[PDB]
């Protein structure tokens, strides 16, 4: 219901999926969309095109908040990193910032290597 006009787009790009969450600058999520929920399952889900469609729906899902400009925090290694940002600019948001917030331990033991 409430107007904001200043949001943050959190792109969570993993190898298997992309989650786009548009929050307000204090971190309260206004809307979200995922590549998996866009009609893409399995192999389709991990594609830059699917992550692009996720951004298109998250722009539509937070439409009634009247967001005019947006900061972009990209997290993760997945294929839908740069694909999502171009789709958020294409939607009609003015991108204020693009920052990487991918977590790096300086940490815990990672899982064992896959023998495939």
């Amino acid at each position: 219901r409430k107007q904001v006009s200043d949001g943050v787009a959190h792109i969570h790009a993993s190898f298997n999926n992309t989650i786009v969450t548009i929050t307000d600058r204090q971190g309260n999520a206004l809307g979200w969309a995922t590549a998996g929920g866009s009609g893409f399952r399995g192999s389709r889900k991990s594609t830059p095109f699917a992550a692009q469609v996720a951004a298109e729906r998250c722009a539509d899902a937070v439409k009634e908040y009247g967001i005019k400009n947006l900061e972009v925090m990209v997290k993760g290694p997945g294929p839908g990193r740069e694909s999502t940002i171009r789709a958020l600019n294409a939607a009609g948001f003015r991108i204020t910032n693009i920052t990487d917030v991918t977590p790096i331990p300086h940490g815990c033991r990672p899982p064992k290597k896959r023998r495939v």
Partner: protein, 70 residues
């Protein structure tokens, strides 16, 4: 890799600035290396194999300047 979209910069150049700033930090190189545990024995072998080849290529290139092909 923090990018501020400066005044009067189009998006495509600003996004190219972001990809370049991310590669200098090596965020994607660091993430892929940390997703699986690498035994200390193997992290030392790959370190040794990387040095051995970069040395051999430096040697095998230098004598390429000392040899003709035709």
């Amino acid at each position: 890799p923090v990018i501020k979209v400066r005044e009067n910069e189009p998006f495509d150049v600003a996004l190219r600035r972001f990809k370049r700033s991310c590669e200098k930090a090596g965020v994607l190189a660091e993430v892929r290396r940390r997703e699986f545990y690498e035994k200390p024995t193997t992290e030392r072998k790959r370190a040794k194999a990387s040095a051995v080849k970069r040395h051999a290529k430096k040697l095998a290139r230098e004598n390429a300047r000392r040899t003709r092909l035709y």
